[PDB]
Amino acid sequence: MTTSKLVVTPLGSLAFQYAEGIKGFNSQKGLFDVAIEGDSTATAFKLTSRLITNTLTQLDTSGSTLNVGVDYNGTAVEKTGDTVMIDTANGVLGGNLSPLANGYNASNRTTAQDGFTFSIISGTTNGTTAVTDYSTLPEGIWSGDVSVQFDATWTSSKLRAAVSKTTWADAPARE
Numbered sequence: 001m002t003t004s005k006l007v008v009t010p011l012g013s014l015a016f017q018y019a020e021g022i023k024g025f026n027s028q029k030g031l032f033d034v035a036i037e038g039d040s041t042a043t044a045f046k047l048t049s050r051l052i053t054n055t056l057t058q059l060d061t062s063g064s065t066l067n068v069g070v071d072y073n074g075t076a077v078e079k080t081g082d083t084v085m086i087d088t089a090n091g092v093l094g095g096n097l098s099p100l101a102n103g104y105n106a107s108n109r110t111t112a113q114d115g116f117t118f119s120i121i122s123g124t125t126n127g128t129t130a131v132t133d134y135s136t137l138p139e140g141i142w143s144g145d146v147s148v149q150f151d152a153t154w155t156s157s158k159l160r161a162a163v164s165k166t167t168w169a170d171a172p173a174r175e
Contacts, residue, residue, distance in 0.1 A: 045104035048082035056142035069121035
């Protein structure tokens with residue numbers, strides 16, 4: 001059977017509610033689990049994340065959207081690049097995912113947990129026109145999948161790569 005080299009699992013769901021007092025949406029942390037399989041021949045390890053989808057679309061006919069920002073320690077996780085999480089060759093050990101930095105070349109499996117902070121960073125009235133005032137948006141529900149790709153490579157004096165897509169499915173925002 002095909003054994004899993006990298007599996008990143010979201011631990012719960014994402015949901016956003018509008019708060020009148022701050023004229024915008026609240027924010028949320030979301031934990032995930034990371035499991036990797038050990039490669040004894042490996043001399044370097046690297047883990048990155050990249051944003052895949054982050055659009056919530058109004059359920060009405062407006063075409064209104066909201067975009068979800070994904071933050072890893074004050075660093076955006078984005079569609080246009082890979083956010084470095086672990087990079088052993090350059091001493092980046094990966095904080096609460098440290099145990100992977102220590103176990104990527106062990107002869108077993110290694111797990112660790114971390115999280116992202118999720119918030120609403122912008123939106124559109126109709127799909128195009130940018131929102132300047134969230135309080136003027138239509139009522140009801142915006143919904144969409146928030147998904148983050150996690151890359152993992154195993155260098156050696158030789159390359160093995162694995163990917164895992166983590167999906168916060170049908171994340172709603174409500175006003």
